Ligand SMILES: *[C@@H]1O[C@H](CO)[C@@H](O)[C@H](O)[C@H]1NC(C)=O
């Protein structure tokens with residue numbers, strides 16, 4: 139699962155059959171690291187109008 | 189694909205099903221690949 143976003147430590151508690159979490163637009167906003175089983179929020183990189 | 193969803197609930201009702209809400213988490217995804225049209229559950233006898 140590829141993407142680009144800021145990774146932060148997450149307060150969400152995934153059930154053991156869950157690997158990722160989807161938002162309204164079905165983009166992965168939370169993910170479980172496959173090596174150390176911890177949850178990470180994926181906030182997107184900042185977008186601005188110049 | 190044979191999907192097992194499971195949930196354990198502590199109940200104390202005597203006869204019928206309890207009234208409430210409990211979502212079943214998926215337990216085992218089982219790779220059988222066979223035709224199933226009829227099933228039968230297994231009980232245990234008590235001998236004395
Ligand atoms: C290897 O990955 C497993 C999860 O599949 C994890 O439990 C274990 O701690 C990992 N070991 C190392 C050395 O990263």
Ligand SMILES: *[C@@H]1O[C@H](CO)[C@@H](O)[C@H](O)[C@H]1NC(C)=O
Nearest residue numbers: 189221222223224225226227
């Ligand atoms: C599964 O079994 C039923 C009854 O034996 C039969 O009618 C049906 O055609 C079978 N399906 C397949 C895909 O073999």
